Amino acid sequence: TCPFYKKIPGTGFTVDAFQYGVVEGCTAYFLTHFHSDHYAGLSKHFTFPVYCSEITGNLLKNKLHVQEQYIHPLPLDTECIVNGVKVVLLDANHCPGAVMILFYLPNGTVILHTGDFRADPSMERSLLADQKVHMLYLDTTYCSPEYTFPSQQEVIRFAINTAFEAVTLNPHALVVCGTYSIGKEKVFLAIADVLGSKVGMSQEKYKTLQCLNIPEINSLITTDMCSSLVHLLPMMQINFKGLQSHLKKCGGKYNQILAFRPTGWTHSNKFTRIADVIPQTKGNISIYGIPYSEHSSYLEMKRFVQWLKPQKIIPTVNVGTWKSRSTMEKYFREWKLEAGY
Ligand code: NI
The missing domain is CATH 3.40.50.12650 (Rossmann fold)
Known part of the structure; x- marks a missing residue:
């Protein structure tokens, strides 16, 4: 079944959730980037709206033969409305066309989903600087100090x-x-x-x-x-x-x-x-x-998060083992106590 960390609360939205068949109550499927673990399940037979960058939309059309009428490309760094909810796509510094997504919930909560990213200080001067983020869905691929x-x-x-x-x-x-x-x-x-x-x-x-x-x-x-x-x-x-x-x-x-x-x-x-x-x-x-x-390296990820100061972090990578989950949560608490949020 679709895991909880692929669902955006207070919306009908999922992220990178194309291999579960029809997700109950999903009105829009977001795709952060064109890597197979993320697009797994898309094809010419998909008939729900897909929201993504222009580059990801070129690849969906040309490589997977998704029909044009279901591809909804969005420009970067631009406030857009999707099924009544304000969203912005940001550059994720991953592969070509890879984005992070900012959701502005009707109740006032702000959520950032990083997709896959390589944190960089340049991100500290995008539209992220302009308002507070309450929940961060975080690419934790290399969340250990050895990396x-x-x-x-x-x-x-x-x-x-x-x-x-x-x-x-x-x-x-x-x-x-x-x-x-x-x-x-x-x-x-x-x-x-x-x-x-x-x-x-x-x-x-x-x-x-x-x-x-x-x-x-x-x-x-x-x-x-x-x-x-x-x-x-x-x-x-x-x-x-x-x-x-x-x-x-x-x-x-x-x-x-x-x-x-x-x-x-x-x-x-x-x-x-x-x-x-x-x-x-x-x-x-x-x-x-x-x-x-x-x-992100461990240090690049730590800097991004201590800059952002989220209220709650939801890892999206290495979530399959209790020892991994537990170790990650320990780093999150360290970062928070060191930075004072
Ligand atoms: Ni990737």
Whole structure:
């Protein structure tokens, strides 16, 4: 059945609740972003109103074939009325088209649902600064102090310099980058830009990227693999077996692969600095795991919440075990006592 943390009190609304069949009493289904654990259940046969960003609405239409009449895209940073309730969509700093949603309940309560987010100080100067929030439905993916990671900028710097050095040393090296969903486009696009190459990919993946309103995208990507020295492949193929195989397909155009796996967190982060990251190498193939996150670190999440000072927090991630739930609630209380709200 639909869990309580996907329901917005005092409304007929749900968030990211498409796999439960018809939710009893739901008048509008919100979708925060186009990732499969969140859209699971949508298709051309869906006949209820879906509210989302413009980019998420491009993907619903083009990838899932949802009929246009049921897609209700909303502009960001704009007060809108949905079934008599005022809402605003904010940028979530997650993947393309990902939003947070602010609901202004008729009784005066204000609720923020973060969807999936990477908290940032820039959020402290959006429409959130302008009124008090009573309840926060919080992306708690990495809500434990062991989860530290570098800025996105530092990670992209590392990847750009690594790729540039390798290819200038060996002009016959191929760069490969793994992907399994939208998000993290900066990794492969920044590498292609420093090398003066387009990124080559499957027709399915080119179609997905063409829905994202990225500027000058026709200049950066292509389906002609032959003309490209940055290839994108499914994340599952980013291993020695899958990479040797791909190298065989390139017809002796290349004699070395340098591959990037943009993971979330990995426990090399407790010890290792970004400066100190090394590949796993087998023969003429090297694989780098880089900690490019599109979710809040523990410290980034803590700062956002101590700034917002919500009256009640409802976690949306890691809610399936009592030890996780209990540990999260302990951090919430610490933050509150330290900050004084
Ligand atoms: Ni996500």
